[model samples]
Target: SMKIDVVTIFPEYLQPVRQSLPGKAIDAGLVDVAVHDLRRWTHDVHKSVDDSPYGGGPGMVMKPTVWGDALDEICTSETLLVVPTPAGYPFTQETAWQWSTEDHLVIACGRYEGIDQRVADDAATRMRVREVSIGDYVLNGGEAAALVIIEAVLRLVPGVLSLLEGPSYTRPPSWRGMDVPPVLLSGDHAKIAAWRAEQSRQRTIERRPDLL
Candidate 1:
């Protein structure tokens, strides 16, 4: 089994993870997951987590001290620290596949301008750390990206996909005058495989030519 911990300012944003397939995986004991409020380690009355960037830029950077405390208490030598940011590496199916084999994962969800660079830099010396982005565009914060990454990786975990696969259709032989792809209904496994492969290739070439 794998363990995943998420540290975020808005724990409610992560509620869906507790309601979907990820939630069922938890119920099945396939994984262990915990969500923490980043403010838990704050000592001040305000429980502040961010500060203005030292270089005089735009949004505030997450305070390293707060993040440090949170991570120190949560991560272990086997844990992979995942920080979600627009400036990080692209999160792809390959990344998810790689992460699925890890024993533990800790996702630090940052807001405003994102976490202090030192947080990730320091963690790198102690354990594996990856700053990942779900896509090219930025979101308001990392909470959503955290969810995306978690859902992707968890499904690839050993038993989670004991559940499903692929682009598929069922029993609406003909709908609105449009028939199901003839090949899918042919019951010829070899031809069906070839057709599906060609469809996937054409779709990828049309939409993600860079993958070629």
Candidate 2:
């Protein structure tokens, strides 16, 4: 089973995680997930985890000390540390497949302008550090992105989708305005495979040409 540790300032925001797909994975023993509060590492009474940038900035930046200490206490050598940011590389099916095979995954969800750069830099040296973005947009925090990533990756684990015949299962031919190729409905396995491959390529080209 893969283990996932989520380090966040607002740990309550992760409450829904235990009731979703990741939760299901945990229930089935395919995954183990734990959420940690970044504030626990804070020394001040206010439990402040963010502050103004050194040179002066608009929004606050997460403090390096708090993040660094939190990560150091939770991360392991086998953990794949993920940070979601707008400037990160686009998350994709390939990345999901890669992460699903890991023994541990540590995700850091940042707020404000994002976490201190030093924290990210230090974590990179100890584990498989990755910066992932769900799309070409910005979010108030990385929590949403972390949820998206966790669901995508965990669903790829061996027993998680036991009833679905794996990732190769067929999707419906037509949904809304888009039509599934006629070959798929024909029920010829070989021809269906070819059609699906072509459809996947064409869809990628049409919807996200940058990925091609």
Candidate 3:
């Protein structure tokens, strides 16, 4: 089974991940997911995990010490560490497919302004560290992004979905007044495959040209 560990200040925020698509994967024993609280590694009475930014910034940066220990304890060579931030690489279907091949994954959900740069830099030496952005906008934290990425990656795992069902089973092209290519329901495998690829390409181009 693939294993994933997520470190976040608000561990409860991962409840949706544990109860949704990824939860189904876990229930099927295809994957194992664990959420860790960053405050658990704290050493002070305050359980403080952030500090005012150096050189005068508006928001606090998550302290490296807490993250360093948390990452060191959880990450492995096969682990892909994902950090979600607006300044990061665009998260795409291709990225999800790539990550699904890993034996394990570690997601670091940063809050406030962001995690200290040292945590990201140091973690990169031992594991693949990817800073992924779900879209152009920023959220209050990375938990939602992590959840989005995990669900996307999990669906790509073998046996995660019904077999030979095609993309329409998992991803319908449209709804309401819209429609997917009519060729999909014709029951011709080759034609369906070609049509789906064309549809995928067209949709990507029309909606997310930057991804192409």
Candidate 4:
């Protein structure tokens, strides 16, 4: 089973992740997901997690001390740490596949301006680390990106989505003047598989020609 933990100040942002496929996978023993409040590592009474940027900036940067302490408490030698930030590399299906094989994954959510660079540099000293991004645009927090990553990887966990194969369609077969593809119900296993494969390939080519 894959063990995934998300650390963030906005724990509520992760509720959706816990209620979806990640939740299902946990219940079936295929994956384990836990959300931790980053403030737990703060020593200050205010539970402060961010500080003004050293060079003086508009927004605060996440404090490296709190982030480091949080990572220290949770990461193991085998853990793969993920920090979501706009400055990070593109996160894609390939990245999801990479994470699915890990024994443990720790995702750190960035708030305010962004995370302190030292925290990431420090974590890299003892474990593998990947700075990931959902897209070129920025979001208010990394919690949303964490959710997207979790769902993508969880679906690939060994038994989490074992029941799913290619595409699926339900009855009435015909709805709102649209009809389900005929090959799906033809009962010809070979043709059905081939059809699904071709459709998937065509869609990918149309939407993400970069992959080709």
Candidate 5:
């Protein structure tokens, strides 16, 4: 089972996922997930997590102290920490596969201009750390990315998807002007498997040629 701990200032951003497949998995005893509010570590009453940037930026940077304590509060030596930012490695299916194997996964949701770099650098010294981005563009915060990460990792968890061959379709098999490939309707299991593999490759080729 995969264990995930999410630390974020915007706990509400992680809410919608609470009833999602990953959330249900947690309820069913297939996985473990917990959401932590970063402000919980603050000493002040306001529970602020960010401070003015030392370098003079338009937005404040999430203070390292708060983020660091958030990690210390939840992380063990076994945890793999993931930092989401625009300046990160591309988040892809391969990354999800790697994360699914971890016993503990902690995602740091950096907001505003982003968290202090030391949060990642310091954690890297003690645990596995990967800074990842969903795309080239920037998001308002990492909460959305954390949600994306959860779903991707959950899908790879055992029993999450019964058809390991991936998603399938049925019903009329004909929708609008599009038609399900005839090979899929042929009912030849061996041939269907081969066809699905080809379709998977074709999809990767068209949507993510960089993976080739």
Candidate 6:
């Protein structure tokens, strides 16, 4: 089973994982998940994790030392460090698929501006490190991003996807003047599979041209 550890200031924001589909994966024993408060590593009475940027910035950046303390205690040699940030690489299905095969995943959730750059650079030496963003837009913090990433990657784990059903259709397949593709009603499985594949490709090309 894969192990996942999420480090965030608002661990409450990640509570959805306990009641969502990821929760089912947990119940099924497909993966192990733990959410930690990044502030737990703070040394001050306020348990502050962020500070003013070095060169003078509007928003504070997450302290590298705090992140370092959490990650150093959580990550192992086989762990893949997932740092969620708006300016990082785009998170895609390909990345999710690859992570599904990893034995351990530690996600560092950033707040305010983002985590210090040295945190990722230093972690890269000990483990695989990837800074990923859910999309082009920015969010308040990486807590939501961590949930999105958790669901995307966990569903790809063995036994989980099969446990969830695919799209289902019923009679009167016609809805809102749109009908199910006729190939789906065809008796031949091979033709039905081919049609499904082509339809998927065409839809992807139409909406996500970059994927092609």
TM-score each candidate. Answer: 0.88, 0.77, 0.77, 0.80, 0.80, 0.82
In order, candidate lDDTs are 0.89, 0.83, 0.85, 0.87, 0.84, 0.86
What's the lDDT of the predicted structure labeled candidate 6?
0.86
- Model 2 has an lDDT value of 0.83
Ranking by TM-score: 1, 6, 4, 5, 2, 3
User: What is the alpha-carbon RMSD of candidate 4 to the true structure?
Assistant: 3.9
> Better model by lDDT, 2 or 4?
4
Task: State the lDDT of candidate 4 residue by residue for 167-196, as single tens digits.
Answer: 578999999998999998899999988888
lDDT of 1 at 11: 93
Tens digit of per-residue lDDT, candidate 6, span 1-212 = 88899999999998888566445666777788889998889989988898899999698999999999999999998999999998889998889999999889999999899999999999999899999989988899999999999999988887664011224467887999988777778788999777667767767766777756
Error of 3 at 62 (Å): 0.2
Candidate 2 on 17-84: residue-level lDDT in tens? 66664445567778877899888899799999999999995999999989888888998887789999
lDDT of 1 at 153: 94
Clash count in backbone of candidate 4: 0
* Decreasing lDDT order of the candidates: 1, 4, 6, 3, 5, 2
Which prediction has the highest TM-score against the true structure?
1
Candidate 5 off by > 4 Å: 21-28, 160-212
RMSD per prediction, one decimal?
3.4, 5.2, 5.4, 3.9, 3.9, 4.0
Question: Top model by lDDT, which number?
Answer: 1
Cα lDDT tens digits, model 1, 1-212, are 88889999999898888666545666787888789999999879999999999979788999999999999999999999999999999999999999998989999999999999999999999999999889999899999998899899988887764111236778889988978899998999999988878777777777777767
Off by over 4 Å in 4: 21-29, 161-206
lDDT of 3 by residue, 1-212 (tens): 78889999999999877666445666777888889999998878999999999899598999999999889899888788999998999999889988988888899999999999989899888778999899999899999999999889988888653112224543566777677666766889998878767767777767667765
